[PDB]
Structure formats: C-alpha cells, structure tokens
Amino acid sequence: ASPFRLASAGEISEVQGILRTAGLLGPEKRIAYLGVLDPARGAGSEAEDRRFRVFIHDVSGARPQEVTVSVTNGTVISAVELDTAATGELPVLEEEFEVVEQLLATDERWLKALAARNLDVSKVRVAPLSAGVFEYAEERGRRILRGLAFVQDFPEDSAWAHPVDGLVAYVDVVSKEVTRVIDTGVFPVPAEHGNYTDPELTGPLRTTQKPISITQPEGPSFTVTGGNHIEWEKWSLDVGFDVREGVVLHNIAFRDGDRLRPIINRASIAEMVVPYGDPSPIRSWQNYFATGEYLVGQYANSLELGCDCLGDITYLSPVISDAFGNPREIRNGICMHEEDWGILAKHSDLWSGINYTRRNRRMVISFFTTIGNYDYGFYWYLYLDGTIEFEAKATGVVFTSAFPEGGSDNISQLAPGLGAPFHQHIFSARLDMAIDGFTNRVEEEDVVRQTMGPGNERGNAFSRKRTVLTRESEAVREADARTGRTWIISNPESKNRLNEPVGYKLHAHNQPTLLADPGSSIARRAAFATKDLWVTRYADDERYPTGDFVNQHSGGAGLPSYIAQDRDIDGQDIVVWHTFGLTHFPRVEDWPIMPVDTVGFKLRPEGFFDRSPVLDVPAN
Amino acid sequence: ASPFRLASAGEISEVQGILRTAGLLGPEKRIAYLGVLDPARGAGSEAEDRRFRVFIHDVSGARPQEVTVSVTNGTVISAVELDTAATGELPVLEEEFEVVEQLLATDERWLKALAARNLDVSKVRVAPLSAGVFEYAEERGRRILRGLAFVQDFPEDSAWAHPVDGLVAYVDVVSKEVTRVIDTGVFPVPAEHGNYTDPELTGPLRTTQKPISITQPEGPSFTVTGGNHIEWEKWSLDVGFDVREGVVLHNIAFRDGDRLRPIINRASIAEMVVPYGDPSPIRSWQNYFATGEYLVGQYANSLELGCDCLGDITYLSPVISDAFGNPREIRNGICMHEEDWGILAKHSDLWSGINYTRRNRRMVISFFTTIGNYDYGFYWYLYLDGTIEFEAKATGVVFTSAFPEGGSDNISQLAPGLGAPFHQHIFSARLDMAIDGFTNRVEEEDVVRQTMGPGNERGNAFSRKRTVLTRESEAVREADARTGRTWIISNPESKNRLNEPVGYKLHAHNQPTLLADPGSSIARRAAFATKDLWVTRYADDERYPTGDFVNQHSGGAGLPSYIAQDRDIDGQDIVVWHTFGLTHFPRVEDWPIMPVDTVGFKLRPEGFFDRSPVLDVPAN
Ligand SMILES: [Cu+2]
C-alpha cells in the first residue's frame, strides 16, 4: 500500500495495455523509457493514484511521444508529440546497438576502409556510440549513432585490445543509412591481446589467498517491509529503482527519540557523463551520458552472492519494461547488507580510569551497471552516526585507440601501439532535501584566516563564515579545497536544544570539474558539470541536470535554465545538485582490465542532534 | 636475525646497564626518549652494530644529554651535552604530568582563584600542556608546562565536561615553582556531565544490532617471520616501532615475478601537531606536538580482540623504556590483519560474453594512542593492486572551554555554557622513497586545460604537465585540488616495458594546511604544516620535520633548515614529507565523546608495473 513501492510487473503490463488501448503503442512503437512518477507535494488525492511516464519511440521516424498514464484509472493523463529536432532524441534503445555494425557491414565505403587495413569485416565489432550535437547539417532531425571499430580475433577475444584508429562512421539508425564514413589514415591495429582470463596473460593463479568468512548467525540487523522499505539502526527509507537513474533513495529519515526526523526526501545520481579529451577527429565528438542517453538502470547486472555481494545479503529484483512494454525482471539487481566499519568512538581517560571503545557499522545499498566497455558500481551508505554517503566505483576496460608513433598529449600508452584517450567520469547527485522537513536553506561555509593584531596578538586565531544562498541566481557554486569549503543544508525553523538551526554538512572530494573549453558542445550539453554545486527550488518537472532528452540535444534545458527562474531558496523546498567526478589519465596498470577507482561525497549531521546519537550503541 | 627486528626487553635493559656503569644514569636522571637506530646507508658490513639513541633528562636542571650506545659491544659511542635554551627542551615525561597539578595545589594564587569559583582543590584536575615559545623572557632556559583546570566531581567523572575558563598557570617543573597564575575573570563551570557510560545520558542500549562474525578458517594469508617481517600477497616489509613515531614501516617492497622491487624504504608519521585557534589568552598559546613533544608511541593502547581489532588478528607487543630505563611491554599494541575490500575489478563484455569479477583485499597494520583527551588511530594499508595508504582516525573527547555569553567566532557550543575551541590536527608523513632503488625524483603533475582553436577545434581536449623538482629550494609545494595536482616519485634509471620511468603517484586529500598567521610562533615551530609537500635529499640526522627537540624551541628547526641546504634531488636518494590534516570546528554531535573522523593519503603505482599486477588473483 506504500506509494513508494517498487514498480511491479503488473503495473508495467498495465501501462502497455493502456498505451495500446489509446492507440499509442502500435507495432512500430517502442518504449525507450518507462518509469513510475513520484507523488506530488502534499497528499493530493484522498488515496494515491499510481502514475507512470513513458517516452515512446517510433521506428518509422514519425514523431515520438511523451505520455503519462494512470494505471489506477487505466487512463492516459497526457500525451504530447515530441519535436526531437528541438527538444532532443529519445534514449538509445538496446536493439539499436547492433544496427550500426550491421549497416556498415554492407557499406562499400566501410568495406573499402577495412580492406585497406586487411581486416575481415566478419571480425570487426563496432561500438554504438551516442552522437551528440556538432556541425553536421544533415544530422538535423536524424536519429544518429556513431561507430568506432575494434577487432575481435575470436568469439571470446577482448576486442578492446584491437582498436581500429583513423576510422569512424555516422549512421542513421531509423532510415538505415550510413551518412558518413571518415578515414583519416590507416593506423596499425595494436597486436597484443587483452584477455585477462587467458593463463598466457594471468600466469599461474595465486594460491596464497586464504578464505575470509563473513556471516550473521542471527540474520541482518535491518528489516525490509512492503518490498522496499528499510529500517536499520534508527534509519528509515524506501529503496526505489528507475531504469534511467538506477537505485534511488526515498524518504531518508532518522529515528531520534519518539520522532522520525526526515533528512533527504529523494537522492539519486541524475546524470553521469564521460567526456573524452582526445582532439583527434576520430573521437573528439565522444561524450557518453550513461544515465541520460543510455539509461544505466537498464543495464544493471544480476549480482552473484560471494562474488559481487559478500556476506548476509538481501536482494531486490526490480522490474523494468523492455522495448515492447513487456515487464522484465533484473534478478538480484540490487543488493543490501550491513557491514562492520571499524572504530566508531574510543577514549581511555587518564583521570576517570574508564576505557571506552565502540565499533561503527554502515548499511549498504548498491547495484552495478555495464555499458559497453565500462562497468560502474553505485553505492549508498548509511552510518550509525547519521552520516550519509555515496560512492561510485569505476572499472571495466578502458576505451582504446592507437598510440601515435610520435607520442601524444591526450592519450597514454597501455601496451605496444595501444592508446587510452584521456577522459573524465562526471556524476551529478540530485538531493531533494528535507532537513527536519521541507523548509530548508543552504549555507556555504569557508574557513576564515585572521591577521595577527589587536584581538589576535599571537596570530593563532582562525574562524569560519557562512553565506546563505537566498536566490537560485547566486546558488551556482564552486569548490575551494584551500578554504575547506563545504555546504550546510539547514532548517531555519527547526532548532536543536542549543537554539541553533539543525543541519547537515556536505563534504565534497573537490576533484576537477569539466575540463572542456567553455565554448565547446560538451560544455553546453553538460553545463552542470562545470560547477560543483547548484541549488534550485523544488519543481515537479526539474528532474535531471540535463533535461529529459539528452541524446543529440543541444544546451538550453537542464540546470542552467532552471536557475534562471531565480526563485527564493531561503527557507523553502529546495534541491541540491552536486557535481563530482574522476579525471582519468590511464595507467599501464589499468590494462587489460582496470582495478576499481572511486569517487563520491558525504553529508554529516551538523547540529542536527542535541548530542552524539550513538551513545546507546552497546559495547558488545 | 633481521637488522630491522623489534627492540627486545633485554636490549633496553642492556642500554640501562651501559648508561649506569658509564655514570650517566644517576638518581636525578630520566630517560626522556630511547629508540634503536636504523642501519646506515649500505649494509655491506656483516653483522649490524645494534645502536640505541637516548635523550637523558636531569630533574636537577643540570644539562641533559643525547647519548648513543652500542648494545652489541656494551659501550657508549657518544654523549653530547645539550644546551636546551639553544636546541630545545627534552620531550615531556609522563611523570611530569602529575607535577603540574600537585605544584599548583599548594600555590596561594591558584588556591585563591579556585576559592573564588568555589571549587574544591582536590576535585580540580590540571591538564599538563606544553609551553611553546612566546613573549615570556623568564621562560627561556626554564623547562615549563602550562596548566588548564577541569573539575572532576567524582572518581569516574569526565572532567572535560567541566572546564574552568579564565584561568591558566605556568610552572617550571624543574625548579618546581609556579611562575605565573593568570585569572582573566570568572566563567561558570559548565554544569552538565559528559559521562557517556552513564545510563541517564545513553538511555536504553540498543538491542537491534545483530552480530557480524568475521573469521578465517584456514588462518591469515600473511606470514610473520623474524618477529616483525611481513609477507602478504606479493608485499614484503618490516614493522618497526618507535616510542616517538609509533608504528614505522621498513623496506616496503613488492614481488614482481622474479624480483623483489623496493618502493618505500621507511614510512612513518614523523610529527603531528594540534594548533588551537582561540584568541583568548587562556589558550592562545596552545599547540601540542603529540609526536615531537609527548611521544605518541609511549601511550599506545593495548588493543582488545573483538573491540579494537575484529577478525583473525596477529598482534605485536613492542617494548619501550620507562623513565628509568626499565623495559615496558605494550601488550598487543599493534594489530595486523587482512580484510575484504569490495570489488577489485569487474566487467561483463557484450562481445565475448565473458563475465568477470574479482574481490579486493587490504593488509592492515595499526595501533591506537591516547594523549590526554585525544585518541588517535594510525592505520597503514597495503592493497592487492599495489596501492599504499595511510589513514588517521581522530576520536576521544574534545578539548573544552566555556562558551562565552554573546557567542564566539573561534569556539563552538556543545552544551549549555560548554565550548569547544577551533583547532586543527596536522600530520607529517615522512616517506624515505626507494622506487625500484634509491635513485628517485619527484614530478608535480597538474591537469592542463586547453583552449578551443587549431588542433582542438571542438574544444574538448585536455592534457597534463609534469615538472621535475631538481633542487630542495624548489621542492616546497602546495596542493591544488582544482588542477588535480599530484606528485609522482619515479626512478629515471628504471623503466617499464614501454620505456617509461617507473613510478608511484601520491594522492593527497587536499585539506587546509596551518591556518595561523605566518608571523605566529606556531607558524615558525610547525613550518612543515604550512605546505602540503616537501622533498629533501636523504640524510641520517634529518629525522623529524620539526627537529629533534621540539619542546619550547624558538622555531625554524627541521624542514625549513633541511631545505635551506638546497641539495640536488633530481635522481638521488630522496625523502618525501607530506603534510595533511583535519580542521576541526566541533559539532554538538562530537559531544560527549566524538565519532571518529578521518584523514590520510595514498600512493598508487604509476607505470611501475608492465600491466595490471592483479591478473593472477583467483575467483574464489
Ligand atoms: Cu576512466
């Protein structure tokens, strides 16, 4: 009965039926996106009306549509025709992936380019890459995908070890036409294989690792009810899943005394982009929006016990729609478990003679997705002390290219003749705040150094300052590690026993943001990535920092346009959008399969509680 | 019979005997420091002469001495008379802590100050704080300690909850006289107790935490030989212990196939300082060097199984000297264990159909120390992929004061009338580098943004630049989180299969450095804390970033003096000194006992290996 329950197979089938009945889902139609709509602010209808939103693609080219339906009433609430040439193309369909290689396989220009390289077409894999928006006039109003080739010597061969540089093709996946085939010259195809499961490369397997047994005799400390409602060590929340954003956390709250205190209404990674910094014409257009263009949730992996999730794990198997509206379950796509997290608090007192030690723990909610060569792990952590944290784990195989003989300033060499273009992995966390309720405000906190003089004769004093962001136009902030800059989200109407507004402090990793030139296509399409922190007034239709349609869409929507409304955010229903990412200069150690690298952020209570909230943790 | 073996109780007793028979250990003498000397560069001399370094304090005031003895030959190698007024005072003795409170208890000025506040002198605890160096001319030449009072209502009461503000005294612990008692006014002593084990504060203990069993049925994957030589998953190292620095890692090396490749010769936290930023004259002089002035190693805690260290733990029990030269063992003062560390590498390939997942592990070597109200955990981690990491965990009870009526810009309120002065916890990691040998160099790597134009028409390109630090005069570097600055330690004479110098990249947390005014005493005495990274040419006598006798030294000793030599560091035996710390604006949540906060750094292989070094890890 929870209005925050996961989408069921039945609801998805019902959406399919409603669309069919409305004459909106004929045989030429495809569901590019389907997701449940969150309830509007303030308990509207007496009961909860379950609604879903869908992006309908048309394989014949007719205009696509955005439709919202009520599975409860079996009706179409609204259907609008989409002008893709203006608002953007629909997310890429998995069924379009193979279309690129297949079409090029019969194109004389492509075959000629391969022959010139002595490559057998039957062994050439082509990666279906999003196209973005550049200077190609013919692409206006065309659903395009670009292809980069990789040689696969045999069925189980890792094609990434064999990039075919100097070649790229543009394909219209709807009209089934190869618009362009660019060949800037023949580069040697890196010879070494990158098969990390081949003993020839792994050598004899280590026999030195002893087993580590992690078990919970009496079961986990958390409970799961209503299918996705979690309660663990004072925490309370609902675990949602969206085909686009993946795991989404709802109603994060903390039990303080006799009341459930809200902290975050909705938390998610609203976008993740991978911009490449190689100026070569073959890849200078490369910018992969995993979330917005491909929909990361769609590719969530089924997690194996013992391998992906170790210990006493509780799985959730979310359901998504396939391209035809049929429900598809992602078996064990979300795993949840608690784990020991070292020392929480400790003190040995020289005067009282009392020695005290308490261990910490954290609740883990995660999923792992795979998009082509990359694999990303998304982890949300809840700690005993009230800290909330997110961590992204990037691994998989690096996207490759040829390494020029004369060397490069935008590519690193991973093996003889094998290159790895520089790139970034930039995420955007959308945090719909609710610190003790919806009346919130954000304060930028900087360390303040003081000059030696009257009032500070020894020159030891240092302080800090807090600046309230009152309007959206002044809520676009940059990190400043040098001054220990953080952002506090507080509730001006809710004070702790010391008469201070309760709050939570956001700690960023302060990694470099988007490096692209500000006048580049990517700087516009990924504007959110140019600044560390954005604050907007909550609005039902402001969901992603890049807008609803990112594929082949120019700038104009997303965060920059939202902030333009310059709404009041001083003690209002606000949303924090935090940009964070990794700048990757591939190492030889990253080849042939890369070890995990991490990035993220966390929010710690700041005067939210009246004292430590973990004084009731048992000794043993 | 390793030259890096832990000191035995016998060796300490032997040092004591040598000193006594030499007439250097009379009744008035005290061992202020005692530690074994590392082998000098070049072990080409069979049988290493075991030598110990000793700082001998004279409670009579007669000049103290620095003595080097050979326990192998039973002789005094050298004994130098120390002029403390010039080179600094000796480290504070634990037995001196007590003298401050006892001396003040008989001083009329102190008693009057307490009487006015209606405090029973028998209930007043006095924290023995180091002095420092300021405008007090009568202190030069005198061994001083300052005292700050706290009320302890009963034997098991936490005195930190009851600071006595507006009062501070200075005492000459040698002549045993109170030189000054400053009373700036009466402040209410905070009323609430901070007894975190008292049910009235903890409330009913949670009964919701289910047990987590962590075991290793076949034992740990690491071996310990020669008492302290560790070998784990290709790693090799020696775990040493010094009363001043605590746990020290020696000869960190990694088995790359046929050869044992060195990485770091010696790693340690050579200093840790806690500067306070409250301009009040009661505390504006407060700066305590846990390592240099108090010797954090001597206060290492005995770690209890199941509380401090969980899982299959292997303990080391280092032995230190007491103030009289008697050996004292710190039972289970060092914990060593391995632990699962999530996903190491993962990839599901769409073309090969191969799914691959491998788990990561880390070797943990740690200890926990207690200095008055603070407790610090020191952790060194070795990862499967070759990464080396250090992490400091700060907890304990915050140093308190009164919270002024009218508020404060340098103190936070944690309870009614109770304040917590702003301060920092700044560490210095001394890394004697040995990347594939001693011929090393350091390069500062910055991200480089590129402007849109010829050669970068789309404005997507970005690069990086490396600057070799060739002389010490140019090796005092600052962090720059915005340009993703890191430092690479490479060996220009050792190349990987791609003909590139092998190296390791240092990743800093980019936290704020010393905030105090550049003209302050603390900015001079802890100059190392003003910059993130220093590189010096290796030298036997350059051990600490603050010099050998930190206590009451005028400043400039250590790093500033070493760097002044302006030696060649481009492809030489070098040492990296990394400054990193936490800036603490205490939160209500930190009271009455604070949750652990962390800070650290790590080093990852950068073209050190010819490809991923963890391809030989099994599935398990
Ligand atoms: Cu990457």
Ligand SMILES: [Cu+2]
């Ligand atoms: Cu602190």
